[PDB]
Structure formats: C-alpha cells, structure tokens
Amino acid sequence: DEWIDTSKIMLDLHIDNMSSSDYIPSAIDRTDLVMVQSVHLLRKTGGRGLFAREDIPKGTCIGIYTGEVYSEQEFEQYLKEHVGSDKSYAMYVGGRVIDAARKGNLTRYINFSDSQDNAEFVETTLNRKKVAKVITTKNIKAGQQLLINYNTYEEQASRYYYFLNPGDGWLSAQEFYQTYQSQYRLEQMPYNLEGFDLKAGDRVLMTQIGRIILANYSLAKEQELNASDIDLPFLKVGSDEKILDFDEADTFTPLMAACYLGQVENVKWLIEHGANIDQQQSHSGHCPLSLTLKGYSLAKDTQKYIDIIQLLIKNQVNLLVHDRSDKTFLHNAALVLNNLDFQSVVKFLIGQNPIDINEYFTYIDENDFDIVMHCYNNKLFDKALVLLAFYPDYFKRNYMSDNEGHNQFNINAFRKAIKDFNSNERSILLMQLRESGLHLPEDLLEQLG
C-alpha cells in the first residue's frame, strides 16, 4: 500500500479533480487503455468522461467500479444526514452499496447511454465479496468515449441528460471545425428545413456530401468523394457569424438529413459506407428513425419514408431508442404511421426474426405504458392487434409471469391506460382480447377491468 502511488496514476489518466487519497485502484484497472477528458457538451457543469487512448477490442475488461462501501441501511442513513447527497455515483451490488461520489477510480468517469452504450457492468468476485467489472460490449476506436447503461434512479435521465454519442469529445465546435477545415465550406440555406430548426439564409458549414444531400443529387453518381465526409456533421453558425458550440445547438449528420428528406438511395449509400445509423442529436434526441417518422408525417409520397424504415431495420438499427417522453420507436410509429404502414413496418421486423420480441414490449413510457398499453390509451385498436399478432406471449410474459410484483404493476398500468374508455370502447377491447388466440384466463380479464 506504501507501494501504490495514486498521484502518478491520476497524472497518467489526466485526472485533475481528485485527491490522491480519494483514488482507489483495483488490480485489474487498465489505465494504459483509457483516459479522462472533459466532455465539451458538459462544459457548463465541468463534466468529464472516460475515453479510449487506443483501439479496444470488444469484451475487454477496463477495471472494477471501486468506491466507499456501505450496507443498504448505512447508505440510506448517509443520504439522510448529508445534505445534497444522491445516488449519482452509487451502485447497488451484492447486497451492498458502492458509492464513488467522493472516492473511486477511473470507472467513476464513465457517462450514461441506454442506446449507444459500448460497455457494461458485469458482476465479479473480489476477496469473497461481489462487485462490478466494466467490460467493453463492442470495439472502441481510439478517442471515442466509453458509455454505459445503468439505473439512474431519481435523476430523470430521459428528461434532463444529453443524448451522448461515442464521438462526443473534448473539442469545441470551433476546434472541431479547424481540425476538418479542408472538408468544410460555409453555405447559406437554399430553403427552409424545419426538421433541423433551419430557415432559408441561415449559414451552415457543410461538406461536399452535405451539399449533395441538400441538392437532392445522388451520392452514388459522384466519383470523387472523400471518406471523411461520410459522417462529418453540418455545423450551424449563429447570427453573430460565430460557430454554434455543441451545447448551444444540435448538429446533424448526412444520414440524418437524407432520412428527413426521404432520399432512399442516398440513405442506402450512406448506410453501406459506415454512417452511424443510431446517432442522436445531443439536446433533441432526434435520430435517423425519428427524423424518418417526421419526414413521413409531412410527406406527399409516404412510401419512400417506409422504404427508409425498412432499410434501417434491415441494418439492425436500434429500435429501442427513445425520446424524452420515454417513447420508443414503436411507441411513436403507432401514432404517426397509418394502419397499413404500421402493419407493414411490424411485418419488416417480423422478417428479421428477432430473438427477444419481449424486449420491445418491455420499455414503458413516462405514463408507465408499454407499446400495447400505449395503443389502447390512444384508441388505436387495430395497431394493438398488429402488435398482439406480432407477439402472442405478450400477456403471458408480462401479466402472468413468476413475478407477481411485476404482474400487478402491468395490470394496474393497463387499467390506467383504459381508465377513460366509454361504454362501447371497453367492449370492443374485450371482444378482440378473446378472438385474439391469446387464451386469457377469466380472472385476468377481470382484474384488468
């Protein structure tokens, strides 16, 4: 312990905001692979993040989540007696609480995502007791940010966090631009784009590929294109002729614009050449799926937006992505798509023969409604049937499982979802439930109201 110099650990990690006696290493920490940097998006609160110093293969162990150790009772009493304390850095694992709000190691710097996470907490043993390891869940390029999914308790992450991307770094927008200066050119918007809060005459820094998308030309037709321009974002410029920093305005990529404008072949081109199909705008959350849906809602030709939905699904887009209301793709598609198109999109998903169909039916919105409850709350009976056909085990897996706590929660949520139904609306619901082929027991139909 006399042999452990945490001061040089922090210097090597570029950690500048911890006391050396607050740094708690584990024997399997890999400081050689990672580094702490500012996340420019978070500059207003001086937030940091953990980043890769080199390429990291999928499945690599990064370290142990260390911190102060409490029993659940001791930690509940800690929160009570320390004004301003929270569960921000607290992990409930192995019957204890590990809290890294004051003390811990490099793993305390990893930020949150539930749609672009590239690492995970895995339970491991450490001197006869249970803690968590951080393992990468996909390949990480040098300079990309480590992101992780965990229980954010009372922080209301969906409402208040940024939608972080692995390419969100320590550079400002201005520094970002000068790094790729040769690929960029200042343009004026040739028309309005309400999808990205742009008006004709707004100045936007964009690439050749960008220009081509806004011109509605074909990317395939072009023969001198640069590979960097694939995902180089449009950067908006302010009324004072200065670049809008990352936390002052959302950027958007070529793929995002192609999807919003309904450009099928350009979407297909951009997917194949490595565009991040799950990229999210930091403040708004808009992604290629959501922008495609928005395009659809305004479209003259709705079919091209459907073909783009099909293309994203064919390339395993994360359909579990959600907005700030906690509505997933299937939540919102049910509101925006007409019956034929909703049916058709569910058919695409069927064609992918998903392993865990239940995972789509498990994410609940801010109202506690999963996607089936969501349809019913919106009088979308035909949509509901399409989902029920899609997933027959829906009621069985979520209302009649081995977990009565969970079962009763879903039963109450369901009641909540239909609590405004009228004389007629509860009978049509009851009708389709029985000819469904779902074989619902009488006692379930009753406590469902």
Residues forming the annotated binding site for S-adenosyl-L-methionine?
Answer: 48, 89, 112, 155, 161-162
For the CB of residue 100, give the shortest distance to ligand SAM in the complex, in Å.
7
Phi, psi of 438 (to 5 degrees): -90, -15
Phi, psi of 41 (to 5 degrees): -45, -35
For the CB of residue 432, give the shortest distance to ligand SAM in the complex, in Å.
40
Q: Are 249 and 203 in contact (CB under 8 A)?
A: no
Instruction: Return the H-helix or E-strand segment holding 121.
Output: strand 119-126
Instruction: Using DSSP, state whether 379 is helix, strand or coil.
Output: coil
For the CB of residue 301, give the shortest distance to ligand SAM in the complex, in Å.
36
For the CB of residue 91, give the shortest distance to ligand SAM in the complex, in Å.
9
Nearer to ligand SAM by Cβ, of 155 and 326: the residue is 155
Contacts of 149 (CB under 8 A, 6+ apart): 112, 113, 114, 117, 120
For the CB of residue 20, give the shortest distance to ligand SAM in the complex, in Å.
17
DSSP 87: S
DSSP E strands: which ranges in 172-230?
A: 185-188, 203-206
Q: Are 118 and 137 in contact (CB under 8 A)?
A: yes
Output the six-digit token pair for 215. 């011109």
Q: Are 292 and 264 in contact (CB under 8 A)?
A: no
Nearer to ligand SAM by Cβ, of 47 and 449: the residue is 47
Binding residues for S-adenosyl-L-homocysteine: 48, 89, 112, 161-162
Task: Using CB under 6 A, list all residues that contact ligand SAM.
Answer: 47-49, 88-89, 108-109, 111-112, 155, 161-162, 164
Nearer to ligand SAM by Cβ, of 155 and 425: the residue is 155
Nearer to ligand SAM by Cβ, of 14 and 397: the residue is 14
Cα–Cα distance, 208 to 268 (Å, whole number): 18
Instruction: Using DSSP, state whether 166 is helix, strand or coil.
Output: coil
If you count them, how many residues does the chain have?
Answer: 449
Cα–Cα distance, 373 to 364 (Å, whole number): 9
Residue whose entry in the numeric block shows the structure tokens 């390029």: 141
For the CB of residue 124, give the shortest distance to ligand SAM in the complex, in Å.
19
Binding residues: 48, 89, 112, 155, 161-162
Nearer to ligand SAM by Cβ, of 88 and 192: the residue is 88
Nearer to ligand SAM by Cβ, of 164 and 189: the residue is 164
Nearer to ligand SAM by Cβ, of 161 and 269: the residue is 161
For the CB of residue 39, give the shortest distance to ligand SAM in the complex, in Å.
7
Which residue, among 101, 94, 166, has the nearest Cα to 136 in the 3D structure?
166
